[PDB]
Each structure stands twice: as structure tokens, then as C-alpha cells.
Amino acid sequence: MMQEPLTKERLISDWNSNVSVAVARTTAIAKSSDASLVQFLAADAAATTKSTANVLKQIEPLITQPAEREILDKIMQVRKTYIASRDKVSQLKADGMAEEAESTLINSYVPAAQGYLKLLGELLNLQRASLDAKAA
Amino acid sequence: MQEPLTKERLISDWNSNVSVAVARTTAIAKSSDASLVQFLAADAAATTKSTANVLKQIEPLITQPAEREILDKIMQVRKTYIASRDKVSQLKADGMAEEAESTLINSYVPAAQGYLKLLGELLNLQRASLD
């Protein structure tokens, strides 16, 4: 059974929210012809990725059992791809290279974001099941 | 324990939806390109339908006078919020680019902030039950 499942569930809820926010923001950036939009959203984007960095600092020590450790390792590998593609979409759009940004969005960012959210859901499912198994 | 836990989970989904909509609406307002209104419209409709579904799910689970008071206030604030959200997109579609930005700042964001504050208050009632 997962230990401290409720604490991890709350941290993953915030993490999921941050990913969902960043996906909405990056998608809007990629599809707008306004190259300056990435600059006008940059402080908000920095706040969202910092919030996840903080979640990671809190949650990593609490992820202990093999099933949740295996998922966390998978999340960290996909997150590397996700961050590289997010930053590339943003740089291309800032640089006026709109077609390349749109191509990167679909070819790289979207699959990485979808995998990131799917793995976060697998991680959450482990926690929720453990908590629901002790609730009574 | 199960009832406040289910409500906490629903409120966390609701909070995510509002947070996503605030980011999306902010991008629509600040983009000089008004085409985001149409290209993001189905994603925005899905985020707001998701919240409509959470509202239907959580209603039968409301048990306490303070929950009901907060939910009633959320319904009022959500009306103000939805009108302003929709107005940002209508202004962008109508070519009123500067007014879309000013309406974001002076109407949509304050309503969203009050909406999130109330969701936090509703969430804290569940945390109190779980502690």
C-alpha cells in the first residue's frame, strides 16, 4: 500500500493543474500569430513551472513503493521531453518562426504533454486507491 | 471521511478548470491575433462543460449550511465571471483588441479571483472535516 496517499494526492492535484494550465497556455502561444504573446505570458509561465518545481521538491521523498517509483521515473523522463518541446515552441514563436512552432507543437509537445498527464493519472490512481482502501 | 474526500476531489477538479480558463482567457485577451477565439473555442467549451458537470456532481453532496452559503455565492460570482469571460472573446472577435485587454484586467480577473477564493473556502470545509 502507498503511505501518506492523501498528502501525495493533494500534491499531484496541484501538479496536474499546473500541467493543464501550461498546456492551455503553450497551445494558445503556438496558435497565435502574435510573436510577442510568449513575452507577455512569460511571468505567468515562469510561475507555473516554478510551482511544479516546488511540488517536485515536496513529493519526491514521499514516493517510496516500487509501483509509484516506477511511474515517477517515467514521469521524469517524459517531463524532460515535455520541457524541451515547450521551450522550443516558445522560442520559435518568439522568433517569428510560426510554421516550425506549429509543427513542433503537434509533433513533440502534444504527445509529451499527453503522456505526462497520463502518467500523472496513473500515479494519482495508486494514491487514491490506497487512501480509499483505508478510508473505512 | 468518504464524503468530504469526494468533495475535495471534485473541488480540486473545479479549481483546475478555473485555473486553465484563466490562463486561456488571458492568452486570448493579450494576443493581437483574434484567431485564438475560434481556434480555442472547443477547448474552452470543454473546460466550461467540465465545470458544469462538477456542479451537478457536487450539488447532492452539499450538507452543511456554510457549504450551501458558499455554493450560493459561487453561483452569483460565476454569473459575473462567465459574462466577463464571454465578453473578452466577443471583444476580440469584434476587433476591440484594447478593450479586450482592459476587460480582462478590470472585470474578468477580479471575478476569477473571487471565484477561486470561494472555491478555496469550500475546499477548506472539506479539509476541516478530514482533520
Residue numbers in the entry:
A (entry chain A): 57 to 192
B (entry chain B): 58 to 188
Question: What do the study authors state?
Answer:
Bacterial chemoreceptors sense extracellular stimuli and drive bacteria toward a beneficial environment or away from harm. Typical chemoreceptor proteins, such as the well-studied E. coli chemoreceptors Tar and Tsr, consist of three primary domains: a periplasmic ligand-binding domain (LBD), transmembrane helices (TMs), and a cytoplasmic signaling domain (SD). MCP2201 from Comamonas testosteroni CNB-1 binds different di- and tricarboxylates, which are represented by TCA intermediates. Citrate and L-malate have been found to be the chemoattractant and chemorepellent of MCP2201, respectively.
To further elucidate the mechanism underlying D-malate’s role as a chemotactic repellent, we determined the crystal structure of D-malate-bound MCP2201 LBD at a resolution of 1.5 Å. Consistent with previous reports, the structure of D-malate-bound MCP2201 LBD shared the same four-helix bundle (α1: Q59-K87, α2: A91-L118, α3: P122-A150, and α4: A154-E193) with the L-malate-bound structure, with root-mean-square deviations (r.m.s.d) of 0.43 Å, and D-malate occupied the same binding position as L-malate and citrate. The pocket was formed by all four helices. More precisely, residues Y138 and R142 interacted with the 1′-carboxyl group, residue T108 interacted with the 2′-hydroxyl group, and residues R135 and Y172 interacted with the 4′-carboxyl group. The malate enantiomers in the two structures appeared in mirror symmetry. The structure indicated a D-malate-bound MCP2201 LBD dimer in the crystal. In the analytical ultracentrifugation assays, the D-malate-bound MCP2201 LBD predominately occurred as a dimer, the same as the L-malate-bound LBD. The dimeric interface of D-malate-bound MCP2201 LBD consists of α1 and α4 helices. Hydrophobic interactions are contributed by residues L62, V77, A80, A84, and L187 from both subunits, while hydrogen bonds are formed by residues E65, R66, S88, S89, D90, and D188 at the interface. Taken together, D-malate triggers a similar dimeric oligomerization to L-malate.
